Structures are given as C-alpha cells and as structure tokens.
Amino acid sequence: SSALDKLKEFGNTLEDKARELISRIKQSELSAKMREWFSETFQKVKEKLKI
Amino acid sequence: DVSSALDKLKEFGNTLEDKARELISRIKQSELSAKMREWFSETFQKVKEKLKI
C-alpha cells in the first residue's frame, strides 16, 4: 500500500495548500481595496480643497 | 485588470481544493481494490494448500 498512502499524503498537502492560497488571495484583495479606497478618498479631499 | 486576476486565482484555489478531495476518494477506491486483490489471492492459496494436501 506504499504508492497509495504516498498519494493520500499528497492529496492532503494539496488540499491544505489550496486553502492557504485562498486565505492569502483574500488578504491581498483586502489590502488592495483599502489602498485604492484610501488613495481615492485622499484625492477627493485634495480636489475639494484645491492645492 | 487586477480584479479579474484575483477572482481567477480564487476560482483556481477553490477547484484545486475540490480536486484534492476527489483525488483522496479515488485513492480510497484503489485501496479497496488492492485489499481485495490480496484477500482473493491469499484465500485461493489456502484453498490450494488445503486440497493439494
């Protein structure tokens, strides 16, 4: 059963890496959306108070 | 187009998770086969030993 249990460990590492990836994608998305929001808000404040 | 990029990676990650689970089920299917192949061969061996005797 050597090739089988080797494949089972493989499936489990894959599953864990997929979930890790998803979490990092969402944290990056949160980071990017806050960057864009902050910058846009700043620019609007700039625009409303000239230079 | 960053938005479409992160979304595509989200979709990839979700599918990879699903395929990993399917892989594990396929492995348990082969496990069943291997165990039965052993049970059949061993049992037949005994049939021979018991009778050839």
Residue numbers in the entry:
A (entry chain A): 5 to 55
B (entry chain B): 3 to 55
From the paper:
Apolipoprotein C-1 (APOC1) is a 57 amino acid polypeptide of Mr = 6.6 kDa that is synthesized predominantly in the liver of mammals. In humans, the plasma concentration is about 6 mg/dl. This small protein is remarkable for being the most positively charged protein in the human body, with a lysine content of 17%. The protein has a high affinity for lipid surfaces, particularly chylomicrons, and both HDL and VLDL particles. APOC1 had long been known to be a crucial player in the transfer of lipids between particles and the general clearance of lipids, but its mechanism and the manner by which it bound to lipoprotein particles was poorly understood. It was then discovered that APOC1 is a potent inhibitor of cholesteryl ester transferase protein (CETP), which is the crucial enzyme in the transfer of cholesterol between lipid surfaces (tissues) and lipid particles.
The structure consists of two basically identical long α-helices, closely associated with one another and aligned in an antiparallel fashion. The helices are about 75 Å long and have 13–14 helical turns. The structure is clearly a natural dimer; it is not a consequence of crystal packing. The total buried surface area on the two monomers comprising the dimer is 2,595 Å2, or about 15% of the total surface area (18,355 Å2) of the dimer (program PISA; CCP4). On one monomer (A), on the amino-terminal half, there is a near-continuous stack of hydrophobic side chains. These are Leu11-Phe14-Leu18-gap-Leu25-Ileu29, with a gap between Leu18 and Leu25. On the other monomer, closely opposed to the stack on monomer A, is a different stack of hydrophobic side chains from the carboxy-terminal half of molecule B. This stack is Leu53-Val49-Phe46-Trp41-Phe42-Met38-Leu34. The two opposing hydrophobic stacks are not only in direct contact, but are further consolidated by the intercalation of part of the side chain of Trp41 into the gap of the opposite stack between Leu18 and Leu25. In the less hydrated (34% solvent) Monocl-1 crystals, and the even less hydrated (25% solvent) Monocl-2 crystals, dimers are so closely packed, molecule A against B of translationally related dimers, that the sheet or band is extremely dense.
